[PDB]
């Protein structure tokens, strides 16, 4: 097969990261490891941490656009009622 260009991911053995030295791993078999030991206290406190650091960036745009949609929908159902029909007459023309 032909050669190809320089990529930024190699394969197992020549992956292409920087050379690393003196960094040791430690892992235990999952047969001697108890899974889901960290669901209780975890799904409460870590989930509250993940919500607290991260909710306000979602809650302010939702608040802005929901308030703007609600004000627009309220103004719609105002001016297509009997009370605002002359205003509908002057803004539709």
């Amino acid at each position: 097969g032909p050669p190809s260009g320089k990529t930024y991911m190699g394969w197992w053995g020549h992956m292409g990261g920087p050379k690393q030295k003196g960094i040791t791993s430690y892992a235990v078999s999952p047969y001697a490891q108890k899974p889901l030991q960290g669901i209780f206290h975890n799904a409460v406190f870590n989930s509250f941490r993940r919500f607290k650091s991260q909710f306000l960036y979602v809650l302010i745009p939702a608040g802005i656009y929901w308030y703007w949609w609600k004000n627009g929908n309220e103004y719609n159902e105002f001016l297509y009622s009997k009370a605002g029909r002359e205003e509908l007459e002057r803004v539709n023309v």
Partner: protein
């Protein structure tokens, strides 16, 4: 040949070889590297090297006595070799070296020079001897938080904290009467050694060594010492083996012998009768490997260590090796068992009946410390002849088929995959 044994609190066990030209006489203690907490670690190495110190070796060499020592997981030894006419001189020297005094060996200058030398040797071992430090990390992660995990060599961070008080505390707690066996191998008679010990006094201590609460327990884990600036990729991999005094001792060793050892550069090593070689020689997956069946007092290890330069095909090496390991449970043939019988008779008779008396002294001391008497080689050959294929299949189903493994590696081990594919390759899914 014959091995005799007698007792007075000390244990005197010999092997009168009248054909040999030397005679080794020494004491083999029953403490080892597995009897240290992780803060005084390496104190046995430091006793080895103050016994082999320059002043002590000079005083030994004045009479024509060569010293020798050994630090294992289970047993220490302190062996003095001489001509067969100087067994009294060797006993009196060993008496003067350990029993009669220790303060002249433990002077300030001798201790500081020896601590400097062992710190140099441990650093040189740590950064230059790669397959042995892989095997030491394999022990350190197979048996972790448990006293069989401690290396015999000691660690740099602990060994620079030892002072003379720890040496004396270990000596008072482990160099004892019941803990020791005095061994004479080579060209000495048993009656001469017993009459010469009773001619002196040679009483080491009162005895009754620490119990050591934790019992060794295997723990499947891994450790990865990845160093990209090394030319090879050294990797050991083992399961929980058989300890000594087990009925599956020779079966575990014969299972190690089935897949043998290999060196890719030797021509007669590439032609062995192993079915792993047909898979391993095609794309040159490794440079060497050896299958080991290590047996300790509490537990053991069974696995293989290897080294390779083909760092992109390490997973294929592990894959074909472990599929060959899975062949033991299902379909190991009769001819492989007969071949492993013949080769294990060969290497076992080379090990126990080599010409060197100090190795005989180490082996006899370890065996009569653990199991009270030495099993002679003829009964060992009968026990090897009693093994059938069904025994190997039952042992492999007990110990190999879908059991946890322990992995240690250093060098360019990025090609080595995760723990889970290596663990899941222990069972074939096709059986």
């Amino acid at each position: 040949a014959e091995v005799t044994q007698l007792s007075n609190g000390i244990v005197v066990a010999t092997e009168h070889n009248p054909s040999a030209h030397t005679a080794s006489v020494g004491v083999v203690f029953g403490s080892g590297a597995a009897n240290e907490n992780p803060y005084n670690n390496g104190v046995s190495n430091l006793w080895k090297n103050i016994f082999l110190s320059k002043e002590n070796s000079a005083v030994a060499a004045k009479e024509g006595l060569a010293l020798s020592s050994n630090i294992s997981r289970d047993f220490q030894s302190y062996i003095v070799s001489s001509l067969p006419g100087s067994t009294d001189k060797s006993l009196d020297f060993l008496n003067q070296s350990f029993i009669q005094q220790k303060a002249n060996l433990l002077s300030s200058s001798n201790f500081e020079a020896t601590k400097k030398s062992v710190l140099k040797q441990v650093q040189d071992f740590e950064e230059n001897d790669h397959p042995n430090r892989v095997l030491e990390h394999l022990h350190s992660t197979a048996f972790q938080n448990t006293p069989l995990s401690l290396p015999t060599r000691g660690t740099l961070e602990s060994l620079e904290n030892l002072v003379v008080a720890d040496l004396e505390s270990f000596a008072n707690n482990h160099f004892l009467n019941s803990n020791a066996v005095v061994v004479g191998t080579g060209n000495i008679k048993h009656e001469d050694l017993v009459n010469s010990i009773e001619s002196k006094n040679l009483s080491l201590q009162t005895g009754t060594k620490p119990v050591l609460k934790k019992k060794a327990a295997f723990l499947g884990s891994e450790v990865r010492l990845r160093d990209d600036t090394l030319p090879k990729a050294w990797i050991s991999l083992a399961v929980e083996g058989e300890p000594v005094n087990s009925p599956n001792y020779f079966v575990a060793k014969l299972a190690a012998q089935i897949f043998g050892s290999y060196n890719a550069f030797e021509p007669a090593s590439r032609l062995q009768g192993i079915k792993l070689l047909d898979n391993i020689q095609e794309y040159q997956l490794c440079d060497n490997f050896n299958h080991f069946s290590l047996s300790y007092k509490d537990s053991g290890l069974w696995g293989f260590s290897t080294a390779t330069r083909n760092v992109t095909m390490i997973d294929d090496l592990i894959h074909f090796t472990l599929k060959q390991w899975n062949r033991l449970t299902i379909s190991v043939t009769d001819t492989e068992v007969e071949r492993a019988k013949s080769l294990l008779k060969l290497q076992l008779g080379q090990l126990y009946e080599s010409g060197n008396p100090v190795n005989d002294a180490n082996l006899l001391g370890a065996e009569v410390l653990i199991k009270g008497s030495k099993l002679s080689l003829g009964e060992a050959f009968k026990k090897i002849d009693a093994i059938t294929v069904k025994d190997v299949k039952a042992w492999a189903g007990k110990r190999l088929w879908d059991q946890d493994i322990a992995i240690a590696g250093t060098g360019q081990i990025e090609g080595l995959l995760d723990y889970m594919r290596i663990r899941s390759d222990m069972s074939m899914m096709r059986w």
